[PDB]
Amino acid sequence: NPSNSNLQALREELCTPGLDQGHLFEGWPETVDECNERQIALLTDLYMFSNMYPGGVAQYIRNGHELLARESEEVDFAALEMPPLIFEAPSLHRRTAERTALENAGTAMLCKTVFVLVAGGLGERLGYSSIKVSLPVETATNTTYLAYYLRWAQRVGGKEVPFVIMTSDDTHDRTLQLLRELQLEVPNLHVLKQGQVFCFADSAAHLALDETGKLLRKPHGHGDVHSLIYNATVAQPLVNDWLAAGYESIVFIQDTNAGATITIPISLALSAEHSLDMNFTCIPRVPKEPIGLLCRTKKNSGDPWLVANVEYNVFAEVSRALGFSPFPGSVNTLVFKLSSYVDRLRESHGIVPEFINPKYSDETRRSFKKPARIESLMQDIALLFSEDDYRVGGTVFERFSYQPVKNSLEEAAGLVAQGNGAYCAATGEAAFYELQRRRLKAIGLPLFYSSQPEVTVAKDAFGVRLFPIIVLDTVCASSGSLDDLARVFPTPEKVHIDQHSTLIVEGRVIIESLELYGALTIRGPTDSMALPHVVRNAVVRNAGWSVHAILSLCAGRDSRLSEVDRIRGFVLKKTAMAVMDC
């Protein structure tokens, strides 16, 4: 592709007024041949950018100028208002006729759903040096987010479920390694790697270089997922392949919110009941939260309305131009009617509106503290869905079903002091255990237990509780619907799990009657279709498990403490354990 002639032309083009990238060729020979490998390689990098980005590096620069101008002003809409199509989901912890009806319809729809996991983001802000999807959902079983999503999708959509994972340079190799180590076998998985974009050293959009003198690169945002899907093939486009196989929905999830497996079925059912082409997953928002709001927008006067996510800072500002909050918070679990999604994809080529958000070094000088780059957000695909021919709404769920692992222990302490959500590894794990319990009680399991915390973390800033710990695998519990849970416990009044107990269940298991004071693993057939291992009149007493806090005083020569332990601030002591197999 890279003719020496085209590379000179592009070099010429980039030095023209309005592009002005002369500072890249300081001290260079007049023509390409006279250039060395190191320089000829920089030109090549610039050139090849064309097949990563529409219009290549020249268009990228121009887009930068336009965005740098745009973002010096006040993003102001002419009109802002409650989205018309908002729907309240019933509680996840009450087995009402509605909830049953919605879980049943949504669970059937799961058979015809494409799943998309965005997992290109860095996990350091947490102070976790591995990929986020390798974090455990809980440390009782240590099941990773990656396994958790994939096993659930294969359970509800069958082994051949279509699944996409977006990775980036940061997470990609480690993602393939984790798939391999978990012995996950997902025949229709596509791993699509997002490419990095160039960075701007300054307000005039001059490209930045790193230490080795190479074009500096940063991520373009989770927005990339649409174009990556648009371009992927199986000579046939991926999406054509989905449509032709009968798939009817597509859902996008983020990398560490276990709540998605509970909200999705309900969202699907409501997308169907209310004919939604795009359905944002929401929770009631607290005025301070670092979370976007679902709004009905009108950019400039007389413009059509658009239902889109918008950030708070923008919301305060725009309100100035002209119960938690009238407006819902979008958690970025996005549920689409597939045909509608494909239409918008084909027409846009998966390209969505962009922005830039430079972090300056001053409130004063237009000087960047660090190079900026153009970004995009995957939810902004909503902008391409006009109110004329598409129905875009949101479903509001209980805040509790939103359980991301976003913050370090130190961030969470500060957040909690300001009255906000910690959303850290400790409260992620705790919320997961609590979620199982609330669900199981909803079908009549009699769980009595203290609301008091059992360990404190973050230098005594706040506490969590973990027990009783009850974890059912996807063979055991299937989709996790209330009905599916009731098949595991068909006579729940005879199952007595004490507040300090641990119950781990794997495989085809039915528990009719049990008294548990301690820790127990019950294993049944790994085959979903095999004859179940049935437990009746079991009585199990042992020392069980405990949890304790990681003490300030940490050794680093002979400790088996990992980052996984440290980011939550406690460890489970797995002191004893009864096993029932067969």
Ligand X SMILES: O=C(O)[C@H]1O[C@H](OP(=O)(O)OP(=O)(O)OC[C@H]2O[C@@H](n3ccc(=O)[nH]c3=O)[C@H](O)[C@@H]2O)[C@H](O)[C@@H](O)[C@H]1O
CB of 375 to ligand X, least distance (A): 8
CB of 54 to ligand X, least distance (A): 18
- Told to check if 255 binds ligand X by CB under 6 A, we report yes
Q: HEC profile for 341-404?
A: HHHHHHHHCCCCCCEECCCECCCCCCCECCCECEECCHHHHHHHCCCCCCCEEEEECCHHHCCE
Q: Where are the alpha helices (DSSP H) in 363-424?
A: 409-417
Torsional class of 157: left (φ above 0), alpha (ψ -120 to 50), beta (otherwise):
alpha
249, 267, 387 from 276: Cα distances, Å: 11, 10, 11
In the list 14, 68, 137, 291, the residue contacting ligand X (rule: CB under 6 A) is 291
- Told to check if 427 binds ligand X by CB under 6 A, we report no
| Contacts (CB under 6 A) with ligand X, residues 133-172 | 166, 168
| Contacts (CB under 6 A) with ligand X, residues 374-393 | 377, 379
CB of 380 to ligand X, least distance (A): 9
The Cα 473–Cα 151 span in angstroms is 9
- Told to check if 222 binds ligand X by CB under 6 A, we report yes
- Told to check if 118 binds ligand X by CB under 6 A, we report yes
E strand or H helix at 356: strand 355-356
13, 149, 272, 323 from 175: Cα distances, Å: 39, 14, 34, 41
Nearer of residues 139 and 332 to ligand X, judged by Cβ:
332
The Cα 356–Cα 60 span in angstroms is 12
CB of 377 to ligand X, least distance (A): 5
In the list 83, 90, 106, 120, the residue contacting ligand X (rule: CB under 6 A) is 120
Q: Are 308 and 382 in contact (CB under 8 A)?
A: yes
Strand partners, 534: 510
- Told to check if 119 binds ligand X by CB under 6 A, we report yes
Q: Are 107 and 156 in contact (CB under 8 A)?
A: yes
Query: CB neighbours of 553 closer than 8 A, spacing ≥ 6?
Result: none
CB of 65 to ligand X, least distance (A): 22
The Cα 328–Cα 295 span in angstroms is 8
| Contacts (CB under 6 A) with ligand X, residues 309-338 | 309, 330-332
Q: Site map for ligand X, 388-417, x if CB under 6 A?
A: ----------------x-------------
Residue nearest to ligand X (CB): 121
- Told to check if 351 binds ligand X by CB under 6 A, we report no
CB of 352 to ligand X, least distance (A): 12
Nearer of residues 255 and 506 to ligand X, judged by Cβ:
255
| Contacts (CB under 6 A) with ligand X, residues 180-219 | 194, 219
- Told to check if 358 binds ligand X by CB under 6 A, we report no
Q: Which two tokens mark 374?
A: 């153009």
- Provide the binding-site residues for ligand X, judged by CB under 6 A: 118-121, 166, 168, 194, 219, 221-222, 254-255, 291-292, 309, 330-332, 377, 379, 404
